[PDB]
Amino acid sequence: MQIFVKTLTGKTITLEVEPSDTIENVKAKIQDKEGIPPDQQRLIFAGKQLEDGRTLSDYNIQKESTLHLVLRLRGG
Structure with a gap:
């Protein structure tokens, strides 16, 4: 299934996920598309x-x- 992530400077990226994917693992999909470590994401x-x-x-x-x-x- 498809969910949208709206970045802080204001771009949209589209990630292919499952209902059982953790917020942890959607952050890993942001690392893939954007080059950002999960650690530095909220x-x-x-x-x-x-x-x-x-x-x-x-x-x-x-x-x-x-x-x-x-x-x-x-x-924090």
Whole structure:
């Protein structure tokens, strides 16, 4: 299935994922497309950040959904 990631400077990238893919593994798909280590990524949906251990089907993300990428510079 297809989900959209909207970057912090404002590009869209499209990632092919499964409902059982962890937020951890969608960050690995961002590393593929964009060249960014997962470590330096935080992801948002509906103004709420996503925990790495949770799947796409535990936040109830169905295809065509915009998850949003924020790059981390500071601790935390």
